[PDB]
Structure formats: structure tokens, C-alpha cells
Amino acid sequence: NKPLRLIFPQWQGGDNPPYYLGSQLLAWLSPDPKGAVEEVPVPKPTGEPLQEENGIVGRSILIDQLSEARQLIEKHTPDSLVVLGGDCLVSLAPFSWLLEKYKDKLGILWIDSHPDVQTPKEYKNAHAHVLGELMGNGDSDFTRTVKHPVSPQKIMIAGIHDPLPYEANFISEHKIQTCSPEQVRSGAQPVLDWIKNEKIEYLAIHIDLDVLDPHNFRSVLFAKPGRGQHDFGDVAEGKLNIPDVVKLANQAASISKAVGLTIAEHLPWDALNLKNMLEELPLIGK
Amino acid sequence: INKPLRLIFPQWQGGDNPPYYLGSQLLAWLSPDPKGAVEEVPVPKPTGEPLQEENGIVGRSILIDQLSEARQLIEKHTPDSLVVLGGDCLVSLAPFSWLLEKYKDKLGILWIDSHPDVQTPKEYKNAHAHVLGELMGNGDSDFTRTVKHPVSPQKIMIAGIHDPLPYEANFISEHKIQTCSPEQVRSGAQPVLDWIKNEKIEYLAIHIDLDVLDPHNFRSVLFAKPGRGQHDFGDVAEGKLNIPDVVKLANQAASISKAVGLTIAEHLPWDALNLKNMLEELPLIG
Ligand SMILES: [Zn+2]
Ligand SMILES: [Zn+2]
Ligand SMILES: [Zn+2]
Ligand SMILES: [Zn+2]
């Protein structure tokens, strides 16, 4: 067995500098690694704004980091991947690798308030594109790297609620299964039935931390200090708590072999503000 | 030459709250690189075994041992300045006592806190509420006996304090301790600047209790504990300042006096702790 942990502090897919610290802090908080560790080279945020590049903010650097993530994976030819992001787009190369290795026996359990199936026609921040790209849909600079696109029947989106009209149509068109926060709480029966009926032997788990209720976990986008009610376009916000997500992941991993785990979209507002405070205070560091 | 010392002091027993330990380690990781020497006070990690009240003080004996060891580490370096990454507020006892021995009545103590920390075991069993009084030579003899040069009360300024308890209002009045309210801080901190000028404060020790911060905007303090109710903390005063107010205040004061001490205390990073435990419990990484 050969696991690889990828520290992937990508922040450009969500155009939000604090993802970088969020990935480094996630890495610091994590248990000791079981196998190999690599960090994907990501330029630190400098305050210079990213620009839209043919409909995608930061297109060029995202393609570079996607290429470098794949190179680091190939270097270790791992059978399992833990990805410490970073915005949701960090899962593209890791889950593409797992699709090449495990093919139609892989299922993708996408734990997110949102389905991440938009394209640059709908949204300029690429962290909303990644699950669609794993199906081979969307912007070809990204889908060209996906050699074994996942069937929509081998996806389960858990924690999703109140989807946008585009997203509900996409989910409906492609027959993609979902599992609401309510059904996660009541035992995640759709996830168990899906693993059995779609013969999911290997499992890639993506945890977008914004599946979590921001009232109880305050290091996600929707817990940004000083926010107003409509600051995020009234898109869906998290309704699960950490024990719900842990239980769901362990339920699914008990009836299939977990080979992927991504933790994405950590936005540690307190740690960021504390880091900046210490930099600005007298004496310390000076 | 000037000899600085950074003291990492993950004491959690003074506030009887295990997450202070992680709070100190995280603060050390978030801080800029140290300029001089670094020591870490050995503190036993919380084991879940509850601390006991010992003659009116929770965890009395281990707090005395940690005080003695912190003093030893300071005297090993005989530093001219000290940065203390706590830890509950009691971590400032040995560092500020040393600074008082060195700088004597030329030192002012700027205590940035929602609370004055002048209680004794008669009022409160958690020793983090005792430390400023002990620096004045008041209170429990196991702690005051270590303070060779007690600070005179006119060389104290408590900034960010509001709505004190009756015992504390009487203590402050009887000893003529100067204060500065959150509102006065936001309007320019005129009481603090006046105090530096009028008392001719030449050297400055700054204690920052992070619970001076409004828990609505900084969520890593006691009063931002997820799921709290309104009266869980006895309706004691809660923080009203924001991080930019504290940074400005500290830099105002250090612009007209020589900063020789800085303590950052009472960090309780609820999100980091909850994420750390989540990762330990998840498949593949846990
Ligand atoms: Zn996502
Ligand atoms: Zn999301
Ligand atoms: Zn305090
Ligand atoms: Zn306090």
C-alpha cells in the first residue's frame, strides 16, 4: 500500500487569498502522514488581483498547478490520496488519478453544500467547476486531463440543498444522486444503497468544509466576520456539523475501500487575522 | 547587547480549559520568526482527567511548578525583553515580574483585557483572574512571594475594561488604578497616552488578553465557544474591541515608550480544535 498526502494550498480557484493559510493550517493540524507527502508549488497571495482569462479567473496559474499536482502524483504512483486543500479544484488531478487506477469501480462521494458542476459560462471561479470536469464536462483546458471521466451514476452529492436552477437541471439531466442534510442525519441510507447498487468498490471522498453549518464551524466562507445576509448571492449554506460528516465518511468507508480524501475550502478567518495582528504588533518578530 | 527571549507557555490550568494548550502552540506557529532565543515551558498536555481545587486554586501545585520553571528559563537568558505566547493570563506572572526587577519603577504595565485580573482565591478559583493583582503584590502568597518588585498601581493601565464586578470596581477605586474603556480606545486611547506622558512611563510591558476582542468578530476566545448560551459565563463583561483597535493601541503606546514585554494570552481556537479532532476520526487520514 502506498498513500500520498498532497498539501495543495491553491487559492486561485476560489479567488480568495485565505485558502493558502487554510491549507497550511490544515496540514499543521493533521495527524502524522502514513505515507509520502508532497506540497504542490502555489504562489503566495501578494495582493495583486488575479484577472479573468477567457472566462476563468487565474486560468494560466491553475493549469500550471494542475500539471504540477499530476507530476507529483505520478512520482509516487500511489494507491490512495489525501489532499489538503485549498479550494475545491484541488481534487481534479487526484481524483483523475484515482479514476485511471480504479476505473468504473470508483465512486465519488462529494460532500458539499454545492455540486460544483458549473462551467465558465455560469461562473468565473473554477472551484465551482471541478466535479463537472471529472465527468469530462466543461472547459477543455481542464477536461483534457481527465482520461477516464466518471459516469454520473458513480457520483453521490451529500449535504447539498436548495440548488440553483442551473444545478438542479444539470443534476436532473444526468441522473446524479444526492443526499440531503436531512437524510445524512437520518442514517445516509441513499449513500449505502448507492454503494451497494452501483457496486462502488473504491471510494474517493471530497469534503468541502462549507457543507458545515457556519454557526458551529467558523472557518468557512459563510462565517466571514462582518458578513451580511445576502453577501454570497443567497446561495446554499452549510447545514451539517462535524460529527455528521465524520459519521457519513466512516459509514461509506466501512462498505467500500476509501482511496481518496480531500479536505477543501478551509478559510480560517481567526487564524488569518491573528497572523496579521502578530505581524503588526510591537516587539514580536522585530 | 539587547537579549530578547520568546517564551512559548502553553499553560491551560490557570483558566481550567484544555484548549489553551492548542491555542498556545497555534499562536507560536502563526507568529513571525523569532529574533532571539526561544524557550518552551514544559506543560503537561490535558488528559481529560479533571483538575482539582487545591486550597482555593484549581491546579495550584502544577501552576506553582510551571511558574518556577518559567522563571528558571527566563533567568537562564537574563533577557532585556520578553515575548510570551500563552496560555491563560497567568503566564505573564514570571515574565512581568522579571521585567519589574529589571526596569523597576520606569516600567508601565498596559493590561489589555475585558477584565482586570485582580481577584484572589476568595473571589474566584481559576488563577488566571489573579495575575495582575499578584504583580501588585496582592493576593495568594504562593504567587506574590515570587514578585520581588511589585508594580505600583499608578504604573498600571487597564484598557478595554468595562462593566467590572463590584469587588473589582472597589479594588480599582481603592488603589487608584487607571482604566480606559473600549469606547475610549476607539476614540484615540487618550487615557493611555495621557498616562504614559503623565507617569513618565519609559519602558512598557503589554499584556493582551484576547478576550478583549468582540467574540462576534474574533471567534477564538472563551465567549465565542460554539453553542454557548447568553448566561453561560455569569454575564461577566465580554470583549468589545476588534483586532485593528488592539494593534493601533499597542503601537500608539509603543511609539512613546520602549516596549520590553508582550504577552498574547487566552487564545481558545475552537475551530482548530474541532478540525484537529475531525481529522483524527476520518478515514485514510485518521
Ligand atoms: Zn465545493
Ligand atoms: Zn461549496
Ligand atoms: Zn486576563
Ligand atoms: Zn479576560
Residue numbers in the entry:
A (entry chain A): 5 to 290
B (entry chain D): 4 to 289
Anything the authors wrote about it?
In the reported arginase structures, their active sites contain a binuclear manganese cluster that is coordinated by one or two water molecules and two histidine and four aspartate residues from three conserved sequence motifs of GGDHS, DAHXD, and SXDXDXDP. Among them, the ZMO0432 gene product annotated as an arginase (zmARG) has the three sequence motifs found in arginase proteins.
In order to get the structural background for the enzymatic activity of zmARG, its crystal structure was determined at a resolution of 1.65 Å. The refined structure shows four molecules in the asymmetric unit of the C2 space group. The elucidated crystal structure of zmARG shows a common arginase fold with a protruding α-helix at the C-terminus that mediates a dimerization of the protein. The refined zmARG structure has shown two strong spherical electron densities in the pocket of each α/β hydrolase fold, which were modeled as zinc ions, based on the X-ray absorption near edge structure (XANES) and a fluorescence scan. The deep pocket with the two metal-binding sites of zmARG is lined with residues of the arginase-forming conserved sequence motifs of 89GGDCL93, 116DSHPD120, and 210HIDLDVLDP218. The first zinc ion is coordinated with five atoms of Sγ of Cys92, three Oδs of Asp116, Asp120, and Asp212, and the metal-bridging water molecule, which forms a distorted trigonal bipyramid configuration. On the other hand, the second zinc ion is hexa-coordinated with four Oδ atoms of Asp116, Asp212, and Asp214 (bidentate), Nε atom of His118, and the metal-bridging water molecule, and forms an octahedral geometry. Furthermore, the first zinc ion of zmARG forms a trigonal bipyramid by five ligands while the second one is octahedrally coordinated by six ligands, which is different from two metal ions of an octahedral geometry in other arginases. Notably, the C-terminal tail including the α10-helix (Trp273-Glu284) of each protomer ptotrudes outside from the globular α/β hydrolase fold and interacts with the open hydrophobic pocket on the surface formed by the two α-helices (α1 and α9) and the central β-sheet of the neighboring molecule. Based on the assays with deprivation of the metal ions taken from the expression host and loading metal ions into the active site, it can be argued that zmARG is also a manganese ion-dependent arginase like other arginases.
